[PDB]
Design a protein around this ligand. Structure first.
Ligand SMILES: Nc1nc2c(ncn2[C@@H]2O[C@H](COP(=O)(O)OP(=O)(O)O)[C@@H](O)[C@H]2O)c(=O)[nH]1
Ligand SMILES: Nc1nc2c(ncn2[C@@H]2O[C@H](COP(=O)(O)OP(=O)(O)O)[C@@H](O)[C@H]2O)c(=O)[nH]1
Ligand SMILES: Nc1nc2c(ncn2[C@@H]2O[C@H](COP(=O)(O)OP(=O)(O)O)[C@@H](O)[C@H]2O)c(=O)[nH]1
Ligand SMILES: Nc1nc2c(ncn2[C@@H]2O[C@H](COP(=O)(O)OP(=O)(O)O)[C@@H](O)[C@H]2O)c(=O)[nH]1
Ligand SMILES: Nc1nc2c(ncn2[C@@H]2O[C@H](COP(=O)(O)OP(=O)(O)O)[C@@H](O)[C@H]2O)c(=O)[nH]1
Ligand SMILES: Nc1nc2c(ncn2[C@@H]2O[C@H](COP(=O)(O)OP(=O)(O)O)[C@@H](O)[C@H]2O)c(=O)[nH]1
Lengths: 151, 151, 151, 151, 151, 151
């Protein structure tokens, strides 16, 4: 449970606006373990499979267009309930309901524009991960504060 | 509604406790547009002009007085929904009902000493706008990353 | 009640994990006054004395042994509502239930490691307060801004 | 001397790249007073005037145009040695030479865009203040902490 | 010489204009360990017995006075060379010639209100230590990150 | 020269001590471009090859192993003068000679644990880039603020 993982990617806006050091910031202070991460451009292919379940809903292609227009940071975070906790850490997908203190609350205003992405479920989490990252990609180490964070 | 504007002014107590950089930075990083700004001391008739609705109310002149005791930072901000979002940002007029994360929540204790104020309505917005500034103090320009905030 | 005081100790985990400054600051910038502060390793007897009402819980022994593992930072903070406002500042006891922007909410994850302690109640405040420090360790001073803070 | 002042302007670039709040807080937390401050599109004549010691510089006119490009933030700050100290604040003129800690060190890279301008002599100082600001635009007040800053 | 401890005291001005947090934080983040710490109003003799080496000098009793005008934060920190570095950390005694990025650089203006003090030597540092704390107030623990600090 | 590039890697020690968002963040506000990054553990022979030179120097062996003991953040950054400006932002190889305001200065103390590495030549830059990156791993975009960062 304490090993639960999630997939975090900072969208193209986040990277254009200078948010990566910030965003990351928030996860490492939270006490979470950066399992993996890589900066890159997403292929249309990728995205669509990513967003496969969305395939239909109007924004879709724009969405794909957009994810495609710039680089992103893809990463994987490990921890107790990272999935649900980080979700929270990020705010409501529509920045307008995100409160302050949260990724989107603090940093942004429009949904299309929401600078970041998080796995809504541990499933989404697994698929997502595996889809983004080969397995040997995903590092395994122990944080010194482990036993400070973890009971 | 992406042009929306509200009247944000930091109170002499924000001013005095050294909360201006912080506060504008809030707006800055959420991506709203600073339209106008001017550090000034306020006229009693202007306040008065402004605090108009609370005209009597037991705190009324205690207020006015206070609001007049120091210089303030008057500003105009713009963005999709800034009025409402701003509010949010600010917190709950009553700093005890303001959650951490938000300005008041973050840095102040009582409602008398509330560090800032914000248009609570659009119509409201403008009036204060019109009221506090001369339609020529309002700079029309675009953000460099507007395309990153807006689709 | 602007001289309500409260007791806040920064557990061994908040120590080991460097949040001694982050934590204090929050206090400082809100508008509280630090009253007494001390860095020590609480004895067990102290410990038990402390956490007396949970004398019964399954985790009790547990509590106490970690709380004695390392140094803590005890402190008295006074201000208007200190007590109850210091807790919203803290967030949920269970770092998972605790929003962003709060201390827990932002820097920790398990309730067995939830880095800070806050009095829940004025009398507990009282109680702890006394249980932790002799009467004359509590410094008395006024704040220069105190009247920027308080009306 | 501790009532010496200097003229602080934030370049359109500082305005573009959101460093308003940040640069402001720099002063605030250093211990300087905000005498005055407003957001404006400077004019070309003001400009030329404002930058006459440079009337015969390859850049000039480019220097103009650029500064005329967007709005800026004009500010006057007072304090003991504001003028000079303010300048170490800034860093060098050429961001390349600017140490980290400084405003130019920290946020910028090129001379042709170095977000900020500091007065370099008290004369220059008042000269510019003169030039920019309407005496009635200069704030008379006292920090609740003046005591705490000054001996 | 990694268990070299130095005495760092934040002055009435530190305490007054909220930099106790900020201050403790810088030391945190550089990886020194907080051995002892206590919020206490000094005692004229102690002040005396301390600033004994500048018994005569202009200031002196000006110094003593001030340093007792409020409480102070007493601290002991450990780390390889903490002293020298602490100093460095601190700034040049004189707010005047202290670079940005140092304690003083960033938050203070005159040598009269120099928000904190730190040992300037070992020999010194001990004398102060002895002098401001009883032995048992000296917290020995092992930081987790320590071997991440030290090879 | 606006396209120069450097190799920045954050060492395991910096990763163990949550200083990644901070480290990146330093690069991002200055306004330098993130060109490639990935999280990962380095291969012995990746490392021996990277420190190839000081193949002899006593430290070599310990260096290796250390570097190998946990994951790193490997990056590439582009901007006018990134290589030189990038070192200056890092500071002195020896944290002890590092100034406050700099990454090491601020964040670490012993050479052996210096948390990060920056390209010392532009050759080295390009060389180090090789070793470490597959050319296709070099993303290419244009920051929306470049024109504000550069003339
Ligand atoms: N432009 C635009 N994008 C949207 C809209 N609704 C959702 N999206 C995008 O689709 C992403 C994923 O949709 P959803 O899963 O429902 O949110 P997520 O689970 O947080 O990924 C959101 O984060 C948005 O960036 C919309 O109405 N307009
Ligand atoms: N002393 C005092 N001032 C108050 C009280 N309620 C409101 N105010 C002040 O009057 C301001 C305006 O209140 P309100 O109309 O609720 O907010 P606005 O419409 O956003 O300015 C508040 O932000 C406070 O500064 C009160 O109970 N006591
Ligand atoms: N391991 C563990 N510790 C707990 C649990 N519930 C509470 N505690 C711990 O003991 C302290 C006292 O608990 P409680 O009275 O609920 O929390 P409070 O409202 O923060 O003081 C908490 O701050 C926790 O560190 C639990 O279910 N398990
Ligand atoms: N393009 C360009 N602008 C320069 C150069 N030198 C100075 N300036 C610009 O004109 C301003 C005024 O120059 P000067 O008075 O030396 O510098 P200041 O008084 O230190 O900051 C600088 O802040 C730059 O923006 C140069 O070589 N090229
Ligand atoms: N008012 C005043 N205080 C001074 C002066 N020089 C030094 N002091 C004070 O005395 C303290 C100690 O003297 P010194 O050893 O020279 O300071 P250090 O370098 O902290 O140890 C300083 O921190 C100052 O607050 C001076 O010219 N005027
Ligand atoms: N233990 C130890 N490590 C050192 C020493 N000198 C350098 N190193 C380590 O090896 C690295 C590379 O040294 P060097 O090539 O001179 O520095 P670079 O090329 O400027 O950054 C540094 O990051 C240090 O951690 C030393 O004297 N002792």
């Amino acid at each position: 449970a304490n090993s639960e993982r999630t997939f975090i990617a900072i969208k193209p806006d986040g990277v254009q606006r200078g948010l990566i050091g910030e965003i990351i910031k928030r996860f490492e202070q939270k006490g979470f373990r950066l399992v993996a991460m890589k900066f890159m451009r997403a292929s249309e292919d990728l995205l669509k499979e990513h967003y496969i379940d969305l395939k239909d809903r109007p924004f879709f292609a724009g969405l794909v267009k957009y994810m495609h227009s710039g680089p992103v940071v893809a990463m994987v975070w490990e921890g107790l309930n990272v999935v649900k906790t980080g979700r929270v850490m990020l705010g409501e997908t529509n920045p307008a309901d995100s409160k302050p203190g949260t990724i989107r609350g603090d940093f942004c205003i429009q949904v299309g524009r929401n600078i970041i992405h998080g796995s809504d479920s541990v499933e989404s989490a697994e698929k997502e991960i595996a889809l983004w990252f080969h397995p040997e990609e995903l590092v395994n180490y122990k944080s010194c504060a482990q036993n400070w964070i973890y009971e």
